[PDB]
Design an enzyme around this catalytic site. Structure first.
Site, PDB file in Angstrom:
ATOM      1  CG  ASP A   1       0.721   1.973   5.776  1.00  0.00           C
ATOM      2  OD1 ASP A   1       1.500   1.734   6.723  1.00  0.00           O
ATOM      3  OD2 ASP A   1      -0.503   2.161   5.937  1.00  0.00           O
TER       4      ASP A   1
ATOM      5  CB  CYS B   1     -18.361  25.124  12.653  1.00  0.00           C
ATOM      6  SG  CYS B   1     -20.027  24.881  13.315  1.00  0.00           S
TER       7      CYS B   1
ATOM      8  CB  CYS C   1     -20.728  29.525  12.406  1.00  0.00           C
ATOM      9  SG  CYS C   1     -19.263  28.624  12.958  1.00  0.00           S
TER      10      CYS C   1
ATOM     11  CG  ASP D   1      -1.993   1.103   1.125  1.00  0.00           C
ATOM     12  OD1 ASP D   1      -2.088   1.762   0.068  1.00  0.00           O
ATOM     13  OD2 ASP D   1      -2.729   1.299   2.115  1.00  0.00           O
TER      14      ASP D   1
ATOM     15  CG  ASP E   1     -22.843  27.164  15.491  1.00  0.00           C
ATOM     16  OD1 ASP E   1     -23.483  28.182  15.830  1.00  0.00           O
ATOM     17  OD2 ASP E   1     -21.977  27.175  14.592  1.00  0.00           O
TER      18      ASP E   1
ATOM     19  CG  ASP F   1      -1.029   5.107   3.194  1.00  0.00           C
ATOM     20  OD1 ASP F   1      -2.051   4.863   2.519  1.00  0.00           O
ATOM     21  OD2 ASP F   1      -0.787   4.554   4.287  1.00  0.00           O
TER      22      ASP F   1
ATOM     23  CB  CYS G   1     -18.426  25.200  16.417  1.00  0.00           C
ATOM     24  SG  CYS G   1     -18.701  26.981  16.272  1.00  0.00           S
TER      25      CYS G   1
END
Ligand SMILES: [Zn+2]
Lengths: 206, 319, 99
Positions: B225, B106, B109, B91, B121, B93, B118
């Site tokens: 990897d 967020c 917002c 693999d 919120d 990566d 956040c």
């Protein structure tokens, strides 16, 4: 290929055919007072750390070799059986460094080490400042198996692989035979607990 | 009603996956929608029983099959599975390679927030990792050197696959002694590919075999990897399946030269109404896109589902 | 004699499962019983997963097996366990008194 230097060529049941027939190794050891002493001479020289003499120094080199394997199979000390396989295979390393390339392959075939010749690969190095030449090839799957209990220098990274074959030279072919002799001696003692030796012969080696 | 599940459900209905020959001897595993626990210990004997399961029982956000063959695949006791060999895996990566742009915001917002939530919120923050085609070009160099090593130094016949997201996969299907290699016998192969113990051969020819000729051609180690190669029990992502963080096809690459990172990797057609979270001028699937927060945009389904699975916004309707 | 070492490996332990492998179990299977280097890997791993409250990795087990093979160490005696790790003696005797 001298049998006096390499006793493992002749089998135990092949050297005994010189004595007619039926005379097993247990027959000779019960009558011979010195064959057991030559075996204990090698066992007690591995414990102290000294060398092991070449098998060209004995009169019956093949018998001394097998009676030493049998005497270790009676002592049952795993740490001693292991210590012998190193000092024994180390004794052969010196006899292997003075051997032609044809006899080195004749031993690796008897040890079932799949190693053959090939077209020599030459290349240059800066650290050695010499011309390296590899002329023996072994498959990498078998190479990872043979170097199973070796140092970091035998790692797959510091080798030359081509089409799945690791290329070795003369000193690396000897390095794999010494590791194979150490391995076979360990294997050759496990099934030696079978034959019930006469209990008097057990007390002679003890 | 989840709109993304319907796109995935519609795919696995007609899509034919690239399943191995010894299909009944491998453990299947998947990750369902709206969850993170893995459902494994599944055994299927044909592509029609698997198609029945994915469509009607558990739709996979991610879909894998074990690299190891088992005589009893659906057994939880490890030794009861009867391990009988596994394929060799590699693999590559993009974590170590390119290092991409990454924002965390967020979804309400729109301000950039580093923390988990956040403060205004009280919602979980999302992260977007910009996967650029320049990163794929860098990663494509490593798979070319990796295949070169596996073909010229080991004599193996590897296959190349697109990971479906960031990198590539190289798989060597082996049935003989190559599949019985230990975990430590696979690490000597991994560190050989990475050039760990490989010494610098400073004065060798470019035609020399092994690493002597490769070190002098300017090529160093391969960035992989290495944990994937060490593991003797790995879950291979099923080819022709869909990735969970992009929605792209795990496509086999027969020739590395004509591989393009564009919208052809996504099987979805049509158009979607996409509601972005953030105003960003980012590169997506080979082209630059400018999104505006809260202003819907009509883009292709291939590009709409991709941005939804990378937390960049929401797909609201299909047209 | 090393009869009690096989008894603990056949049953299991609880607290000191690593200390029993490092100083006693791994030395007995390699330097006394003489099993294969990879055969002892499965014999030791099946011993650790008896209470199952814990996980051992093959990395640390191979490091102990290859370690005692080179240093040639022999397993501790029950009298030496009473001197050093007294917590492991009670853990073993509780298994020995179970028969
Ligand atoms: Zn907010």
């Amino acid at each position: 290929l001298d049998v006096k230097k390499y006793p493992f060529i002749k089998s135990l049941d092949d050297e005994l055919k010189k004595y007619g027939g039926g005379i097993t190794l247990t027959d000779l050891l019960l009558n011979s007072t010195t064959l057991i002493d030559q075996a204990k001479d090698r066992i007690q020289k591995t414990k102290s750390g000294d060398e092991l003499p070449h098998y060209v120094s004995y009169n019956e080199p093949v018998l001394v070799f097998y009676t030493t394997l049998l005497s270790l199979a009676i002592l049952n000390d795993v740490k001693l059986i292991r210590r012998y396989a190193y000092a024994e295979a180390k004794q052969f390393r010196s006899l292997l460094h003075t051997e032609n390339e044809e006899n080195l392959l004749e031993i690796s075939k008897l040890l079932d080490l799949k190693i053959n010749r090939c077209d020599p690969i030459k290349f240059y190095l800066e650290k050695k400042r010499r011309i390296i030449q590899k002329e023996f090839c072994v498959h990498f799957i078998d190479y990872l198996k043979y170097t199973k209990d070796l140092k970091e220098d035998w790692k797959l990274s510091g080798q030359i692989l081509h089409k799945g074959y690791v290329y070795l030279d003369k000193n690396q072919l000897i390095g794999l035979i010494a590791e194979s002799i150490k391995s076979k001696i360990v294997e050759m003692i496990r099934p030696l607990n079978l034959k019930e030796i006469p209990e008097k012969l057990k007390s002679l080696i003890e | 009603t989840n709109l993304i599940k319907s796109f995935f459900r519609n795919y696995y209905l007609n899509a034919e996956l690239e399943l191995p020959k010894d299909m009944e001897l491998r453990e299947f595993a998947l990750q369902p929608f709206g969850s993170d626990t893995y459902v494994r210990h599944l055994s299927f004997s044909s592509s029609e029983e698997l198609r029945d399961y994915l469509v009607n029982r558990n739709l996979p956000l991610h879909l894998f099959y074990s690299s190891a063959r088992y005589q009893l695949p659906s057994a939880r006791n490890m030794e009861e599975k009867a391990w009988m060999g596994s394929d060799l895996l590699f693999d590559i990566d993009a974590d170590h390679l390119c290092k991409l742009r990454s924002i965390r915001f967020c979804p309400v917002c729109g301000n950039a927030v580093v923390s988990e939530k956040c403060e205004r919120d009280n919602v979980e923050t999302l992260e977007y990792v910009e996967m650029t085609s320049e990163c794929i070009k860098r990663g494509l160099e490593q798979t070319r050197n990796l295949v070169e090593i596996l073909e010229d130094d080991f004599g193996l016949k590897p296959k190349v696959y697109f990971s479906g997201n960031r990198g590539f996969h190289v798989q060597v299907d082996c049935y003989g002694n190559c599949a019985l290699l230990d975990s430590d016998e696979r690490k000597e192969i991994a560190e050989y590919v990475m050039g760990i113990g490989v010494p610098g051969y400073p004065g060798g020819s470019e035609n020399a075999p092994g690493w002597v000729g490769r070190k002098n051609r300017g090529i160093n180690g391969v960035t992989i990897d290495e944990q994937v190669t060490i593991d003797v029990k790995r879950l291979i992502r099923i080819p022709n399946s869909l990735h969970g963080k992009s929605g792209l096809i795990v496509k086999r690459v027969p020739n590395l030269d004509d591989f393009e990172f564009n919208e052809t990797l996504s099987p979805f057609t049509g158009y979607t109404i996409f509601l972005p979270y953030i105003t960003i001028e980012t590169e997506v699937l080979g082209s630059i896109i400018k999104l505006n927060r809260g202003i819907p945009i009509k883009i292709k389904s291939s590009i709409g589902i991709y941005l939804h699975l990378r937390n960049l916004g929401e797909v609201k309707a299909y047209v």
